[PDB]
Amino acid sequence: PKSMQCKVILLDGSEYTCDVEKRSRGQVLFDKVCEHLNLLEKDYFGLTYRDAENQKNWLDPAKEIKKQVRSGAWHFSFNVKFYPPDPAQLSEDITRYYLCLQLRDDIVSGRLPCSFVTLALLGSYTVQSELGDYDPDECGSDYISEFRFAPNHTKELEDKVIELHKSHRGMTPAEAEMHFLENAKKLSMYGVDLHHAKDSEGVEIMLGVCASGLLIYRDRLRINRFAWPKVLKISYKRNNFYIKIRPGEFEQFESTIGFKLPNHRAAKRLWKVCVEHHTFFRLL
């Protein structure tokens, strides 16, 4: 029975290697990674891979791995797929831990923009969780942490992390991680998956997919929001993506809204992540 080697980049940046039978469905690999991670609250997570165009795709757990990675390497990343709106409602601390590690990468990468003060506060909770109480013996006036806190590090940010870290004496790791999450969950781009698109007039916009619905970023003024309940049908055709926007009270007709995506694969990808979010956050 022939088996393919899988390499998975974990959220701590380490590599997990395993073998699965070559006709295996994605769920097989995902189950092995989650067992390795001692993760029980698996519903919020998934594996990603890079397609022949180098775009991040979710590995569909119900489909054969080989029919998704196709010509590409069996290389994956473990990631948060559905960002819980209230991480305090998760049942296990280890779930909140992996969500923290993902968010730390969202921040360093710049996918999750963050004010100076929030970068420092999040950083201070990470340091408290990972090193425990502030120790002056490690931190002089010239201290720079090994922890990546931000897309661009400054001495001022390092100083503010230490100042806040001092305030957290006695805080346990689960407690610090919960504080991290109570702050992160409030950020306007928390758990927003962004897709480049054009509106029906060719004006470049961003579509964001998240727990609350679909977001349209036209300019810094005028951000449109479609709560999942207000969406009845998600569809794609060629390079186009469409949502059916339920009739408003006393309106005769549903309204259909149309976008142009970079190519057909990008329209299908956006359709699938929208359907999956609609399903997940209808049931939550």
Ligand SMILES: Nc1ccc(S(=O)(=O)Nc2ccccn2)cc1
């Ligand atoms: N994770 C997340 C991100 C953004 C938003 S929202 O504040 O824009 N609110 C809404 C409300 C309805 C439809 C779309 N966004 C909410 C949650």
